[PDB]
Amino acid sequence: SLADAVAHLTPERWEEANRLLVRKALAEFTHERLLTPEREPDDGGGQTYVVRSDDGQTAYRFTATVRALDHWQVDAASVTRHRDGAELPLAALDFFIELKQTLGLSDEILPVYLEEISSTLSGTCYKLTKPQLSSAELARSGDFQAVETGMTEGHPCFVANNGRLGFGIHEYLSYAPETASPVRLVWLAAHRSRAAFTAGVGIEYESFVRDELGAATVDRFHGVLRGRGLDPADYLLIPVHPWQWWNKLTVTFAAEVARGHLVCLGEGDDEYLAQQSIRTFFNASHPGKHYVKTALSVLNMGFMQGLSAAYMEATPAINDWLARLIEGDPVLKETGLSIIRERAAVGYRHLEYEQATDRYSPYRKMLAALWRESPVPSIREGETLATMASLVHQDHEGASFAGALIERSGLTPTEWLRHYLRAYYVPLLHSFYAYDLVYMPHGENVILVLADGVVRRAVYKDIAEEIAVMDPDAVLPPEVSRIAVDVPDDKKLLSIFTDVFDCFFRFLAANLAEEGIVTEDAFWRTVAEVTREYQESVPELADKFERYDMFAPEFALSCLNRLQLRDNRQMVDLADPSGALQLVGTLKNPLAGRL
Amino acid sequence: SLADAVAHLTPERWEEANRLLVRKALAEFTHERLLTPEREPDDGGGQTYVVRSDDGQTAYRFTATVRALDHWQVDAASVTRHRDGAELPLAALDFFIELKQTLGLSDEILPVYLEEISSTLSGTCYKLTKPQLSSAELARSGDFQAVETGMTEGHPCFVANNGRLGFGIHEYLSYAPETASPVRLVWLAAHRSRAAFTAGVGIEYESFVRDELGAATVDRFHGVLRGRGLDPADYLLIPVHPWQWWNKLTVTFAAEVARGHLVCLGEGDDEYLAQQSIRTFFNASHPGKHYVKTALSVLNMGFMQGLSAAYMEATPAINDWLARLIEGDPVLKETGLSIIRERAAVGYRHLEYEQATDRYSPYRKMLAALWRESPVPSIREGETLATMASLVHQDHEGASFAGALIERSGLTPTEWLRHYLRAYYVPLLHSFYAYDLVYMPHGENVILVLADGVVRRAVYKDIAEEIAVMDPDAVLPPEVSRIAVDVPDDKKLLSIFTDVFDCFFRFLAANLAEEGIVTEDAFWRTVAEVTREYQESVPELADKFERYDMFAPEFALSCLNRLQLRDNRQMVDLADPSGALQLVGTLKNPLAGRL
Ligand SMILES: Nc1ncnc2c1ncn2[C@@H]1O[C@H](COP(=O)(O)OP(=O)(O)OP(=O)(O)O)[C@@H](O)[C@H]1O
Ligand SMILES: Nc1ncnc2c1ncn2[C@@H]1O[C@H](COP(=O)(O)OP(=O)(O)OP(=O)(O)O)[C@@H](O)[C@H]1O
Ligand SMILES: [Mg+2]
Ligand SMILES: [Mg+2]
Ligand SMILES: [Mg+2]
């Protein structure tokens, strides 16, 4: 109705959303040491802190509990703001304008950054309008996509995390995952002179699209091409995000459309759900068919969600080499690890934009797609699926979704932890130590298999784009050897300490202690024991276990927000070794002393 | 359908659209001396030229007539392109890649430029699907808006002229002036803490909006506010481009919507047509009511079509000063000059984006509006209205619309030229010399009143954004004094030589010569006579006519494409003096030797 598109934008909901983001900015900027909150002694008997603006006129006061890994658990309800003796409302845009110098926001970035904050607050507002499911309801539900679309936090480190800049509000309401709006994919026929299909082992092109689309939808598509005088044999099918088609391909790639390099074939019939990754689609009409990952030229969390055409050629081969490696490794067999492969990929090489740009240009990232197998067919009765991100979910009441899997399970907290850590964490140690293999194993990149509230096994996704072998001489099959990187010995283990300890377990341990379920002490003792249990079981690697010490007293603080604030479009650039990293002192390893 | 949004994008139209844009590229790049065509020996008549790529491997051949002001009338049909012995098809993207260095197209700029070339070509394709009216049929029509929306060329110097980047293809189809789609404006209530209305003489706010919307639409609007707990007294009506609402104001300005600084009221009832200026709307329901000029954060022709809040305070006062000045001057009274005033304006100051940006940022331009009186009430039976751009319109067969006004008038071409030049060109001479006052008097900024094919009088528009008094000490009413600028004496007369002669008459004289209607000699003879006739009628300015000599042998070549090629987003900066200018040698004044 026009008014309906903005109904979620009200003073009360805006207000809650601003208290929520300022709470997280005080928390996470303090963690990253942009803010050093000073204590005031009286009220909470050691619990009240102030942070001042660049000019020192405006003060932010809060109650916080400081947990392992220099984690500030800032109380939302406690946040207040003062200038020259009086109180002001909590306003995120103002907070950023007031601590511009202090956070190293440049004149250049600050405005776009405020636009990403607005958009993050807009989403918070939309989600505060959805039925407010407790973590109990959501865990009891056992609906994979009720959990996928129920998540509210997004990336727990990045403050400006849920931006989706590029979507008008109409497009936010149609495309953001938290809406759970069905999407039909748009299907193009891409001429073989500029498009290329890559198949994983056991994939054949004709049967693959037959399986995905149905014989009848393939023939109809072959009929659009014949009616236009074109030979179906000269084209490959490429599905696209409807936003990419209507806003980019019809304008940016108009030449391709006009010349018949791209023919529009229409919507496919199946209904998709955008996942936490906004450009990845799960097939709601047929949960067993492939996810489709699409090119989407929006700004989110320091990157265009474009998809590289050039990465596609090697992508199924990387997945096949990894699946085979997991199959053949006793330790990985025993954790129950599995991936959902990227089975198939199609790239489109825009020849002219290629002649006009470098290999790093988002103008070469505007038309690819890949298919990735669904985890649904692999589950048995009593099993349900949930993104690992669910484990750091709190509901509207502060109630941990992990806490609710624990209550549902009947296990002690720590028994429950040991099943999860054996399934998710031990594969990561083994992969590091046995093969120098690291993934990007954050909430979004792992799916848990649950049975009566217990983590039975973990499924890694996002394989070709994310995995590395940290050894430049790694002998690999020619097709997968791009994964071989050069990372200095003193940084290798950060793959575990940063991406698991500091960017995930910090939140999990905090949530469980805050809600009174189990001490950080017990939490970290459990991680320690699983670590020792794994190491004891592979004595062949003892020299490497000492070289890369999981029980080192400290490790480097790697600041995630600092990357985004120095560059709101290219967070990490063409550093093909690494070292766009912002390392600022060290944290105390909660494992220090438990070897 | 989906297929229907791109129906205009076919190989035959694409192929035509590229021939037309490469012809224009060769012509105007040559005019601006980026290219230096070399003669091929007189095999097929003489007048055959070659242009080579940066790498000398690609050759562009054409025939061309060279006309006054170094105008290259390149024959579209003659453009051929060759490489290593063999002919290639005409592709504008390739032409730009091949001459990237030659045209000073930087790595940063080239991909965006190509994206604007693509969008311009799509334009041409859409336009070629329309009913192909002869310059006769149009001239005969008498329909103001059939001529407005019937123009195909756009600005005649700029090659990348009809970009509209920001518009998805559905939005192109909705909002582009050449489509003549009815648009309903979206109305916002803006809180008086951040919004200011400004009135000309005779304008009162309440009566104004009552005349524009009708009392019923105001009552309904008032009731939307009351239904939400809000006092209508606390708010001011701002109409916005629906693109700006859905894609910017709901997202970029979300905090203002949420906090109730902006309330959505609905669509207005009346159907508007976008004018050649994409963000300017003519009321088609009520041709008599005000045009509305909108904030539109789209890239077109080297500028966001944003609209400054900051300049609305002075807009109506600048219009009223000028209108009164014209009324007071015997010479401008005899020419019949009038303006359609900017009567009302409303600005919105986003307080936070303002604290985060400088006076120049496009984030201070996303919400403003002004109302400009319609020319329709002022005309008398026999009189029709037509953009001055119509005079340089050719139809699909090369037929000039100026030529058709001439045929239809019964006058000799020169008698016809004299009426036009008295109405349009004399007020610009007298404004320069008497008042140091200049406009931006191109096709878009002038409307002709026509009687029996004759130009009776001209109406200037685009007053507050464009005019200057080139005397820094000029005594002016407090509220219009910003109009006063410092311009070097040796550049003042370029306002005439460049904006009138080199960027408009050059085209008119060439088109009329090309079609066999009248010689360049006679064309410029006529400009000279009218110049002398004006000059002789104001002897008290004789010293100033000697100083700023209209009959000087040369004046500087000012290049318009070279501006957009250096900086594709801010081609003139709002900072530094008339210094963005790219003067490259001089042109022979066709008035030279006719004092
Ligand atoms: N809890 C979360 N943790 C991490 N990322 C999240 C989370 N919720 C949402 N996201 C989004 O998911 C993306 C994570 O980055 P990543 O590179 O893994 O994504 P991708 O490559 O688009 O995904 P995919 O796994 O489908 O290949 C970001 O765009 C981020 O905003
Ligand atoms: N024949 C034409 N001559 C000049 N500009 C044209 C023409 N056709 C379309 N245009 C468009 O109109 C604009 C002209 O520049 P100008 O700054 O005067 O416009 P504006 O301020 O948007 O217009 P207005 O306030 O007069 O409606 C440009 O964006 C240009 O692309
Ligand atoms: Mg991912
Ligand atoms: Mg990725
Ligand atoms: Mg104009």
GROMACS .gro file of C-alpha atoms in nm, chain A residues 2-3 5-6 9-11 14 93-94 97 107 110-112 114-115 118-119 122 165 167-171 186 228 245-248 250-252 254-255 257-260 264 266-267 350 352-353 355-357 361 363 366, chain B residues 1-3 5-6 9-11 14 93-94 97 107 110-112 114-115 118-119 122 165-171 186 228 245-248 250-252 254-255 257-260 264 266-267 350 352-353 355-357 363:
model
  106
    2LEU     CA    1   0.324   0.213   0.014
    3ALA     CA    2   0.259   0.259   0.389
    5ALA     CA    3   0.650  -0.140   0.288
    6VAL     CA    4   0.759   0.083   0.588
    9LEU     CA    5   0.977   0.147   1.073
   10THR     CA    6   0.817   0.297   1.389
   11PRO     CA    7   0.967   0.504   1.678
   14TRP     CA    8   1.370   0.197   1.580
   93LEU     CA    9   2.413   0.737   1.353
   94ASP     CA   10   2.519   0.995   1.622
   97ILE     CA   11   2.955   1.067   1.409
  107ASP     CA   12   3.546   1.131   0.574
  110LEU     CA   13   3.160   0.748   0.714
  111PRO     CA   14   2.852   0.833   0.501
  112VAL     CA   15   2.823   0.486   0.331
  114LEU     CA   16   2.600   0.530   0.817
  115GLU     CA   17   2.389   0.395   0.520
  118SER     CA   18   2.055   0.250   0.878
  119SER     CA   19   1.996  -0.071   0.678
  122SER     CA   20   1.591  -0.138   0.931
  165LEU     CA   21   2.268  -0.195   0.018
  167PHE     CA   22   1.787  -0.337  -0.232
  168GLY     CA   23   1.510  -0.077  -0.237
  169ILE     CA   24   1.270  -0.146   0.054
  170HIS     CA   25   1.041  -0.338  -0.192
  171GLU     CA   26   1.347  -0.557  -0.278
  186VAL     CA   27   1.516  -1.625  -1.350
  228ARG     CA   28   1.378  -1.690  -3.168
  245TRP     CA   29   1.851  -0.963  -1.386
  246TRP     CA   30   1.623  -0.657  -1.344
  247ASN     CA   31   1.889  -0.415  -1.202
  248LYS     CA   32   2.223  -0.531  -1.361
  250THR     CA   33   1.941  -0.588  -1.850
  251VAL     CA   34   2.150  -0.265  -1.819
  252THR     CA   35   2.517  -0.352  -1.751
  254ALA     CA   36   2.234  -0.507  -2.228
  255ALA     CA   37   2.480  -0.572  -2.520
  257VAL     CA   38   2.092  -0.951  -2.422
  258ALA     CA   39   2.056  -0.748  -2.742
  259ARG     CA   40   2.309  -0.964  -2.938
  260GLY     CA   41   2.148  -1.295  -2.822
  264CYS     CA   42   1.565  -1.451  -2.105
  266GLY     CA   43   1.145  -1.678  -1.769
  267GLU     CA   44   1.100  -1.784  -1.400
  350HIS     CA   45   3.197  -1.079  -2.044
  352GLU     CA   46   3.446  -0.654  -2.327
  353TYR     CA   47   3.436  -0.582  -1.947
  355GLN     CA   48   3.931  -0.620  -2.178
  356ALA     CA   49   3.836  -0.305  -1.972
  357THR     CA   50   3.906  -0.427  -1.608
  361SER     CA   51   3.694  -0.608  -1.088
  363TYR     CA   52   3.250  -0.633  -1.349
  366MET     CA   53   2.814  -1.030  -1.229
  596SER     CA   54   0.628  -1.062  -1.919
  597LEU     CA   55   1.002  -1.075  -1.839
  598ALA     CA   56   1.084  -1.120  -2.213
  600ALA     CA   57   1.102  -0.567  -2.058
  601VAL     CA   58   1.390  -0.638  -2.313
  604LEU     CA   59   1.694  -0.527  -2.730
  605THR     CA   60   1.732  -0.715  -3.062
  606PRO     CA   61   2.042  -0.755  -3.285
  609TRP     CA   62   2.141  -0.287  -3.120
  688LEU     CA   63   3.203  -0.079  -2.628
  689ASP     CA   64   3.500  -0.207  -2.844
  692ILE     CA   65   3.826  -0.005  -2.529
  702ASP     CA   66   4.119   0.250  -1.562
  705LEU     CA   67   3.627   0.308  -1.835
  706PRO     CA   68   3.393   0.035  -1.695
  707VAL     CA   69   3.136   0.293  -1.567
  709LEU     CA   70   3.095   0.162  -2.086
  710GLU     CA   71   2.796   0.103  -1.855
  713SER     CA   72   2.537   0.044  -2.288
  714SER     CA   73   2.240   0.235  -2.129
  717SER     CA   74   1.941   0.053  -2.493
  760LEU     CA   75   2.234   0.456  -1.430
  761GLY     CA   76   2.035   0.359  -1.116
  762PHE     CA   77   1.724   0.258  -1.324
  763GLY     CA   78   1.664  -0.113  -1.354
  764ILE     CA   79   1.513  -0.199  -1.696
  765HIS     CA   80   1.160  -0.203  -1.526
  766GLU     CA   81   1.242   0.151  -1.397
  781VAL     CA   82   0.472   1.004  -0.392
  823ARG     CA   83  -0.091   0.828   1.348
  840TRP     CA   84   1.123   0.687  -0.234
  841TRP     CA   85   1.148   0.311  -0.296
  842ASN     CA   86   1.530   0.292  -0.366
  843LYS     CA   87   1.677   0.575  -0.149
  845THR     CA   88   1.309   0.413   0.263
  846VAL     CA   89   1.673   0.289   0.288
  847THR     CA   90   1.921   0.585   0.311
  849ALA     CA   91   1.509   0.502   0.703
  850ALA     CA   92   1.585   0.671   1.043
  852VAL     CA   93   1.082   0.744   0.836
  853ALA     CA   94   1.111   0.540   1.158
  854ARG     CA   95   1.123   0.854   1.383
  855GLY     CA   96   0.832   1.019   1.197
  859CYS     CA   97   0.436   0.844   0.354
  861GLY     CA   98   0.035   0.817  -0.072
  862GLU     CA   99   0.047   0.875  -0.451
  945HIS     CA  100   1.912   1.526   0.704
  947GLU     CA  101   2.312   1.350   1.065
  948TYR     CA  102   2.426   1.309   0.698
  950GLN     CA  103   2.736   1.634   1.026
  951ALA     CA  104   2.906   1.340   0.837
  952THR     CA  105   2.950   1.519   0.493
  958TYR     CA  106   2.375   1.284   0.064
   0.00000   0.00000   0.00000
